[PDB]
């Protein structure tokens, strides 16, 4: 009954991506970011920006014919934060409220097995 996509939220600090794909990931629909909905470079990571992005994405989804979506929430990962930014949960609640259906949230942040090397020096980012 339901036609499923994959939302693939990447909630970084400094930005948030919401962009839905087909079940395979090769075919993408409706990539929207927080910096497409605001004019600061300061609020690109804001929950409001993420919410508006998710709203536009859900609009395009129902324009195409997608009704449900699986969620893969992601942070920067690698050597970087590994914890998600503020605009992930907001986007999720937004595209839940908009009319889409949800199924099988997963957290897919790339985690290393003792990675190469973090940046900042051994003495840290100093401020």
């Amino acid at each position: 009954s339901q036609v499923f996509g994959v939302a693939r939220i990447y909630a970084s600090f400094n930005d948030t991506f919401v962009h839905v794909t087909d079940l395979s990931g090769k075919e993408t629909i409706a990539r929207v970011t927080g910096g497409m909905k605001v004019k600061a470079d300061r609020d690109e990571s804001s929950p409001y920006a993420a919410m508006l992005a998710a709203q536009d994405v859900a609009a395009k989804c129902k324009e195409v014919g997608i009704t449900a979506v699986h969620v893969k929430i992601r942070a920067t990962g690698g050597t970087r934060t590994k914890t998600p930014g503020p605009g992930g949960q907001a986007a999720l609640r937004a595209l839940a409220r908009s009319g889409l259906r949800i199924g099988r949230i997963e957290d897919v942040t790339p985690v290393p097995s003792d990675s190469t090397r973090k940046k900042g020096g051994r003495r840290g980012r100093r401020l």
């Binding site: 409001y48 919410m51 937004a94 409220r97």
Partner: protein, 63 residues
């Protein structure tokens, strides 16, 4: 240009650098059973009524 009525049911506490802002837990009159948290500027009570120009947003709670 739609707006939303919301009834206050619980005052949480003051907020802001200088104490001129208050947190409130409002319950929507229409679309009831929805309870969002909002910032408020002026003197506010429970059973007061606010007109949200934007309803799909929550304020960072302090607790």
């Amino acid at each position: 240009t739609p707006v939303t009525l919301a009834k206050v049911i619980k005052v949480l506490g003051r907020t802001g650098s200088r104490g001129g802002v208050t947190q409130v837990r409002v319950e929507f009159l229409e679309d009831t059973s929805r309870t969002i948290v909002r910032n408020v500027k002026g003197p506010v009570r429970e059973n007061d009524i606010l007109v949200l120009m934007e309803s799909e947003r929550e304020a960072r709670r302090l607790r």
